[PDB]
Design a protein around this ligand. Structure first.
Ligand SMILES: *[C@](O)(C(=O)NCc1ccccc1)[C@H](C[C@@H]1CCNC1=O)NC(=O)OC(C)(C)C
Ligand SMILES: *[C@](O)(C(=O)NCc1ccccc1)[C@H](C[C@@H]1CCNC1=O)NC(=O)OC(C)(C)C
Ligand SMILES: *[C@](O)(C(=O)NCc1ccccc1)[C@H](C[C@@H]1CCNC1=O)NC(=O)OC(C)(C)C
Ligand SMILES: *[C@](O)(C(=O)NCc1ccccc1)[C@H](C[C@@H]1CCNC1=O)NC(=O)OC(C)(C)C
Ligand SMILES: *[C@](O)(C(=O)NCc1ccccc1)[C@H](C[C@@H]1CCNC1=O)NC(=O)OC(C)(C)C
Ligand SMILES: *[C@](O)(C(=O)NCc1ccccc1)[C@H](C[C@@H]1CCNC1=O)NC(=O)OC(C)(C)C
Lengths: 299, 300, 299, 300, 299, 299
C-alpha cells in the first residue's frame, strides 16, 4: 500500500543524454540514432536581450559546437533548426538508442523529467502538464535540454519534452521534439504570463478513490452532485471539468461509491480539511492520475 | 528555481536488479560482483505463520533457486544467511557492477528507492528515514528486495536498504545490506508497531529557507525563538530538536533571515496555514534536507 | 439523554391570563394582584393608521372596557398608561397570583411564551431574545398581550414580555411589564426594520459540548482558535462574540475539549455539514443556552 | 405569522402529577379520580437484570409505597397491574381531575409531553409518534412516568403516554394508560432496537404549505409528480406515503400550489438545501401536522 | 503466560451490521459498500413447512423490505439471490466499510463470530469450523445473519460465515458470503443430522505444547508414536489425522519435546485424566490452533 | 441454544488504546479525553529489583516519554501518580472517547479484557474477577496496560481494570483506574501469593440451569439442600456461598427445578462426572454468571 509520486526508471534515457556546447553556452541534448536534439538558444549570442534566431542560425558555424557523451566527443556534421530546437547530425549513431516515438503531451498528462546539467543526469521526478501548459519543476541555469519521457508497457520510450524556459512566476515550459513550445510560449526572455492553473478534477477523483481503498473515509459526504453541476461549480472555483464517469467504473464498483458522491465531496473539501488529512495530504491532491493510482494499488 | 522531491538517477542500480525465485516464492535481489543479496524470507515455507529460519536454511536446497537478470539465467553456486538477507553466490560476475559501498542510514538521512517487481524496476522515488526507522513508500506484493541507494559526488553508489516489510500501519521497513533490519523490526508476520513519527525540524528549516529564496514569504513572522526554547517546544509538539544554527549560515546570509526567526515561524505555522500554501504545500514539509535544498537552489 | 427545546410549565401563568376588551378590540392581559397589564393599543381607534396615544388615553372611557378570567367578569376601577402598556386597576385581587418579579431581558436570554387568544392560553414554547431585540414566534391576530416568563428554582415567576407587534419581516416584538418596548421599536403600524440577526456563539458552544457528551464527535476539528480571533471572525460572519471561556470549565473538563477547539470547529462548520448531522440538526444550532444544556443533561 | 413547535398548555395536567415511591425507587405517576397510574417497574427489585414481574407483584407490600402531590401524602388503598403500568388506588380523589379520556396514539399523531422528576413538572414540549413507535424527547433518570397528552377543542384531556424507557439508540418509548407499550417494546433492560425512522410525508407537505404562506418560496420547483409516483419514490428514499391530496385543498387554494408540485419539490429538496433555509430549518421538517399548520396560520 | 480462547477485536466488523426486515421477519445483514448480504430465509413465508425459495424470490416485493442501522433508514434498490443469501443493493454506501475479502473456511480453521440481534452486536467469540462442517456457538432467535470473520495483520477483514441454522442437535451452521452452506446443509427446517465430530489432533498437539510451556508436564509419557501410527489410531478413536511434524518445529525446539511424544501422550490421555487437569481442563482440548498457541506464547 | 463464553464487542474501547514509552520500556495506556492512564511501572528503572516509586516519579523527566497511536504522535503536557497508575495529561483530546465511567469490580463480577501490545488490540475475551482478586487471562510481555471493561445497555463503557502483573502462579492482577490494585497486591516483582480460589457457586447454579434448558439433565439428583446447608458445605469444599434463591426465579419457573435441587446436585457432582459431560464440560463450570446465562437463553 501507499501512494507516492514516482518517476519511471531513468536508465534508458540517461544513455541518450549529452553535453552540447556552442561557444561558451553549455546545455543538454538528446542523442537518438545519429541526431542530437537540443534547444536552439544554445546558439543565442546573449539570452538577456531579444534574439534574432534567423540571424543566429545563418551565422552559426559548426566548428563552434562541441558535443560529448560521458566525456567522449561526437563529430558534428550538420545542424537544422525546427521551431525551438536544433537537430544536430553527428557521425556516430547512439548504440544505446531505445525503441522510441515522439509524442506531444496534452494538459493533464503525467510524465517524467530527467533533470540534467552539462550532459549528466542529476535527478528524476514525475510531473503533470498543467492546464496552462506549464509544469512545476525544479531547474536552475544549465537545465535547458533536460528531457521528459514516458515508457509504455512494451518498453517504448515516448520523448515528449525538452526543457526551454522558466517564466517570471517560476513555472516551467518546454517544447516537444518537433520544436513546438507547449502553449505557444516564446523561447525568448520576455514578460510572458501563464493562465492561472486549474486543479485537475479527474486526478482528484482518482486520489479520493485511492483514499477509500486505503481505508481513509472520514471526508466522504453523503451528498451527490451530477457531472454538469460539478462542471459549473468547477469553472467558478479553479478546477477542470470531470471526464466521463465510466472511466471510474472499476473503482466505483470496488468501493460502492459513485463518482457523483466524490464530486460533492470535492465541493465540501475545497473549503478546508479542518486540520485532518487524507493519505497525509492536508488539502486536495491532483498530483496522481487514475492510471497511476491503479498501477500503484494493483500493478 | 523551484523545489521538487526527486530521486537520483536509477540506471547504475537498474543494472544490478534481478529476479530471485525459491520454490514458488518470487522477489527481487541485487547483483553485485558474484553475489546476489535478497531478503531471507524467499526461503520461508509460508509468510502467514511464524517462521523458523534455522529450519528453513537447514532444509534449503540450491536446486530450488532460480535467479535471472532481464530473463538471462544465472548459475547458483551457494547461499549464506546474514541477519534478514541471503547472499547467493552465483557463477557470473555482474559486469555492470558500479563502484560501491554498503552504508547504514540514520534517521533523517534521505535516500532513493527503486521499486521493483519480478526483477524489473517499475518506479523510482526519493524518501527519508524517519525517526521511527520506517519510510513512507508505495510498495505492493512483489516489492520485497527493492533496493535503496545514494550516489555520492564521486559516482560511488551507497547501497543502504532492501525492502522487507509493510507494518500494519502501512509504514515500510527494510534492512541494510549486512541484514540488520532498520529499527530492529522483525522480518516476520506480526503485529509489531512503530514509534511516533516526529517532524524533522532540520528539514523544516531548510524548506522555509527554500521558500524565502523562491519569493514565498507571507508566513514569516517577526518573532525570534532560540534553539533551547524551540527544542523544548518540539518535544511537546511532535518535532525533533534542531541541530546547531551555524549549519544554516549560508542560507541565513543569502536571505537575511536567522534560524531563530524561522523557529518562531514554525511555532506559528504549526497551528495551520489558513487557506494559504508554501511552495504548494498546505502544511509544513520535512521532506527536504539542507543538502537537498542547497543542491536544488545552487548545484554541486 | 436527548436535547429538545422546551418550555417551563405554564400553569402558574395560565391562572393570570385574562381577556381584555375595549370597544370591539380584544386582546390579552395579565392579572397580578388587583392589576391587569395589557398592551395600550387595545384603546387604539384603528391600528391601520398612525395612533395618537395621548389622545386615545385622554378620551378613553372605563365603561368601554370588559375584562374577564375564564368568563368571570372583573370590575374595572381605573387605568394608567406606562409606555406601551395599560395598568388596569380592578376590584378583585387574583387569588392565584404567583410569587413574582418583573425582569427586563437582555439579548441571548432564553424565556417562555404563553401564546393566548381571547384570554385563553393556546400554546407554550421556549424562545431566545435575539441580538436584534426580536424573537421568532408564532402569533396571529389576537395574540397581543401573550406573556413571556421564566420560573426561577425557588418558584418565583419573572414576567418579562408581553406581545406587542409583528414587523414586516415576520419577526416579533414585545415590551417588558414597565411598558419599554424591546429594542425601542414603536408600538405603531410602521415600516420599522430590525438589524440582521447574529447567531449566538455562546449557545453554539453549549450545543457542541452537548453533542460531545451524547457521543456525537465527527465534526470536531483538531485546530484551535483563541477568543480574540474567533471574535474577529464572528463580526465578519454573523455571529456574536463568545463570553469568557471559564463559563464552560465543567464541560471542558468532562469532555477534555477546550472552548478554543470548539471555536475553530464552528469556523469550519459554518461552511456546511456536508450532508451529515449533529443531534439531528443539519446546521449549527444556537437555540440552547449553557444552562439549558446542563439542565437537560444533568438536572 | 410564523411556525414554531409548541406544546398545549400544561396546567390541567400538572395538577395530576405525583411522586410515587416504592422502597427506594422514585418515579412519577398520574392521579385521576382515586387512581394513580405509574410504570410498573417502580416495584422492580433491580433495573439492571431481567425482571420477574409476577414475582415482584406477588411479593409486593403496600406499606412500601409512598405517594404524594406537592409534598402532601396520599393514602395507598390497593394496587393492580395492567400490562406495563400499576393502578394504585388511593383514599383521596383528585379534586383537580380534568374531564378526560384515554386514547392510544398512532404513528404520525402529535402530542405533548410534560417532563417530570420526583412528582414535579420541569418542562413541556410537543412531539410526534414516529413510524417506529418511538419519540425523540429529552428525558434523564427520574423521568419515567412523565405523561403525554392532547387537549381537545372542548377542553377534554386525552391521556395517551407514560414514559417508560430509553432505547440504546436514545429513542424514547412509553405506554398508553391501559399499559400497552407503544410498538410492543418491553419494559425491561435489553438491547431491543427500533425499526427505521421514516420522514412523515404528510407533515412535510404541511410544512411546505406553511413556508409558502410565510413568503418563503425559493425552493418551489415547477415540476409535478403524482401521488403514486411520489409513493414509489418514498419507499426507496426513507419517506412514508402521502395521504389523499384532497386533505390539502384549503391550503392548495390559498397558495395556488398543488400537492403534486410540492411532492416534486420534496424530491428535489431531499438532495440538500445548498446554503439556504426554509422557515429557519436547514433540512426538510416533518415536525408539524396539517392540523398544527392550519391552527398556527388561521386559528380554531 | 496462560492460554485463553480469544476473539480478534470486533470494531471493524461492528459497523457493518444492519437490521433487515421482510414482512414481519427480522434478522441481521452485512453492509459492505452499497450491498447488504443476508440469509435468504428472511423472505420465507413460514419457517415451519418446506420452502420453495424460487417461488418466494420470484413473488418477492421490494416494498416489504425495511433495512436500518440503530434506527437510520437505508433504502433498498434491488435484490438478487445467490445460494442461501440475498444481495440487497442499497442507496447508501457504508462509510465504515473496512478493507476486505471473502474467504471460505475449511474444517479446522479458527474464526470469530460477532453474535448479533436486530442489527446490533451483542457478543464476540472465537470458534473452530469442525470436521462435520458445524460450529458450537451460542445463538437464539434473531441471530441469523451474524457474521464470522478473521482479520489479517494489515487490517483486512476476511468475511467467512453468516449464521443460517441450528440443527436438532444444537449444532450451528452458516454459509459463506457466496451463499454456499458449509457442509451442504439445507437452509430449511429439516431432520438433517451432522456426522460425528472428530477431535482436531493438530490443535490437541498445540495445546499440549502450550501446557509444557506453562510448566504443566505431569501427563507427559515416555512413549513415542510416529505420524502413520497415530493416524491409524485416530480413525478408530474419533480424531483427525495429524499434519507433518515439521509444523511444530519452533515449539519442539523451545520445549525439547517432539511431536511423536505428544501423539503418544494423546493416546494415553484419551483414556481419562484420573481427576487431574491440564491448564484447568479436565479432558483433552482441541479448541486452540497452533497459530493461536504460538501467538499467545510469543506473538 | 448453546452456551459460550463471550466478550462484549470491543470497538468503543479499541480506539482508546495507545502506546506509552518511557526510556526503553513500552506498554499500553488508555486515552480518554486529554488523559492517558497507564501503569506506573513504565517509569521503573528495572523490573528485577525493589522499586522506589516516590523517587522514580520525583526524578522522572517528561522528555523521556513518547506516546503514540499507530505511529501518530501525542504530546505529553504532564504526569501525576495515583496509586499504581500514571495520569498523563496530553495535548490532543481523543475524538473517539466513548461515554464512560470508572467502576471498581467485586469478586464474582464478569468483565471483558482487551489484550493489547504496543498500543494495538490483539484479542478480546470475557473473564471473572475471582475471590482471590486475580483473573486467569493470557498475557505476555507488553500486555501491561491492557484495559478491562463492561458496556451498559446505553453504550456507556465502565472502565474497570488495567493489567499490572503476573504472579508466580501465572495468575493475573490489575488495578482499577484510580490506581488501587485489586486485592492489594503490589506492583513490584515479589513473592506474593494469592489465596486459593473459591468456585463461584452462583455461577455454577446458573450453569446447571443453562444445562437444563439445553436438554442436558442426566446429572440431576433427587436430593434437596437449602442455602444454609449448602453454605456450610461450601466453606469446607472450596466454594463460595450462594445468594438468595429468589435471584433464580425466572429460570426456576422455566425449568421447573428449584435452586435447592441444584445445590444438592453440586454437592454430588463435586465428586466427579464419571466420564460424562455437561454442555461438553468434563467438570463443574463457574465461568458464567446468572446474567450471562439469562442473556444467552432469552436476551
Ligand atoms: C536555459 O536556456 C539554460 O539552462 N541555459 C544554459 C545556461 C547556462 C549557464 C547560465 C545560464 C543558462 C534556461 C533555464 C532557466 C533559467 C533558470 N531556470 C530555468 O529553467 N532558459 C532560459 O534562459 O530561457 C531563455 C528563453 C530566456 C533563453
Ligand atoms: C514481501 O516479502 C514481498 O514483496 N513478497 C513477495 C510476494 C509475492 C506475491 C504475494 C505476496 C508476497 C512483502 C511486501 C509487502 C506486501 C505489501 N507491501 C509490502 O511492502 N513483505 C513480506 O511478506 O514480509 C514478511 C516478513 C511478512 C514475509
Ligand atoms: C396585536 O395588536 C393584536 O393581536 N391585536 C388584537 C387583534 C384582534 C383582531 C384583529 C387584529 C388584531 C397585533 C398582533 C400581530 C398581528 C399578526 N401577528 C402579530 O403578532 N399587533 C399589532 O397589530 O401591532 C400594532 C402596533 C400595529 C397595533
Ligand atoms: C426510568 O424508569 C426512570 O426514570 N427511573 C427512575 C430512576 C431514578 C434514578 C436513577 C435511575 C432511574 C428510566 C428512564 C430512562 C433513563 C434515561 N432516560 C430515560 O428515559 N427507564 C427505565 O429504567 O426502564 C427500565 C424498564 C429499564 C426499568
Ligand atoms: C434464524 O432464521 C433467525 O435468527 N431468524 C429470526 C427469527 C427467529 C424466530 C422467529 C422468526 C424470526 C434462525 C436461528 C436459529 C433459531 C434458534 N437458534 C438458531 O440458531 N434460523 C432458523 O430458525 O432456521 C430456518 C432455516 C429454519 C429458517
Ligand atoms: C508488564 O509490565 C508489561 O507488560 N511490561 C512491558 C515489558 C515486558 C518485559 C520487559 C520490559 C517491558 C508485565 C506483564 C507480565 C509479564 C509476563 N506476563 C505478564 O502479565 N508486568 C511485569 O512484568 O510486572 C512488574 C510489576 C514486575 C513490572
Amino acid at each position: 500500500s501507499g501512494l507516492k509520486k514516482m518517476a519511471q526508471p531513468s536508465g534508458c534515457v540517461e544513455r541518450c543524454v549529452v553535453r552540447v556546447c556552442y561557444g561558451s553556452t553549455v546545455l543538454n541534448g538528446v542523442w537518438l540514432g545519429d541526431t542530437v536534439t537540443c534547444p536552439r538558444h544554445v546558439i543565442a549570442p546573449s539570452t538577456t536581450v531579444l534574439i534574432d534566431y534567423d540571424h543566429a542560425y545563418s551565422t552559426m558555424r559548426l566548428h563552434n559546437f562541441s558535443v560529448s557523451h560521458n566525456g567522449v566527443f561526437l563529430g558534428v556534421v550538420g545542424v537544422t533548426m525546427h521551431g525551438s530546437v536544433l537537430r544536430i547530425k553527428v557521425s556516430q549513431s547512439n548504440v544505446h538508442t531505445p525503441k522510441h516515438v515522439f509524442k506531444t503531451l496534452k494538459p493533464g498528462d503525467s510524465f517524467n523529467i530527467l533533470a540534467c546539467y552539462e550532459g549528466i543526469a542529476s535527478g528524476v521526478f514525475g510531473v503533470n502538464l498543467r492546464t496552462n501548459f506549464t509544469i512545476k519543476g525544479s531547474f536552475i541555469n544549465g537545465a535547458c535540454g533536460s528531457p521528459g519521457y514516458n515508457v509504455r508497457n512494451d518498453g517504448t520510450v515516448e520523448f515528449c519534452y525538452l526543457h526551454q524556459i522558466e517564466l517570471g512566476s517560476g513555472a516551467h515550459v518546454g517544447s516537444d521534439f518537433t520544436g513546438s513550445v507547449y502553449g505557444n510560449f516564446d523561447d525568448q526572455p520576455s514578460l510572458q504570463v501563464e493562465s492561472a492553473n486549474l486543479m485537475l478534477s479527474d486526478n482528484v477523483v482518482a486520489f479520493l478513490y485511492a483514499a477509500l481503498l486505503n481505508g481513509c473515509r472520514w471526508w466522504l459526504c453523503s451528498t451527490r452532485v451530477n457531472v454538469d453541476g460539478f462542471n459549473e461549480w468547477a469553472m467558478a472555483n479553479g478546477y477542470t471539468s470531470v471526464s466521463s464517469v465510466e472511466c471510474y467504473s472499476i473503482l466505483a464498483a470496488k468501493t460502492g461509491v459513485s463518482v457523483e458522491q466524490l464530486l460533492a465531496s470535492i465541493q465540501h473539501l475545497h473549503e478546508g480539511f479542518g486540520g485532518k488529512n487524507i493519505l497525509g495530504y492536508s488539502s486536495l491532491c491532483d498530483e496522481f492520475t487514475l492510471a497511476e493510482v491503479v498501477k500503484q494499488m494493483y500493478g
